[PDB]
Amino acid sequence: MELHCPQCQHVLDQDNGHARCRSCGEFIEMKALCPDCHQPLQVLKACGAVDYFCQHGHGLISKKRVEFVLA
């Protein structure tokens, strides 16, 4: 069933930190927050690989554990 929009109610096509409205046309970007912080994660860019570091003192957070909010 996936996630639906709270406005242009349709399917949200979600990838890494990004959600494009399929069937809507709209483009949405999402923030990667640490669940235990609610502050943004440090996007560690290694060109090919990207790590999400909890800038605060918790360690590394995977994109399957991160909390994505509407940006």
Interacting residues toward Zn ion by CB under 5 A:
5, 8, 10, 21, 24, 26, 34, 36-37, 54, 56, 58
Contact 18, 30 (CB under 8 A): yes
CB atoms within 10 A of CB 37: 15
Determine the residue type at 40: P
Name the residue nearer to Zn ion (CB basis): 8 or 50: 8
Work out how close the CB of 48 gets to Zn ion at its nearest, in angstroms, rounded to a whole number.
Answer: 25
Contact 37, 51 (CB under 8 A): no
Work out how close the CB of 16 gets to Zn ion at its nearest, in angstroms, rounded to a whole number.
Answer: 19
Work out how close the CB of 4 gets to Zn ion at its nearest, in angstroms, rounded to a whole number.
Answer: 7
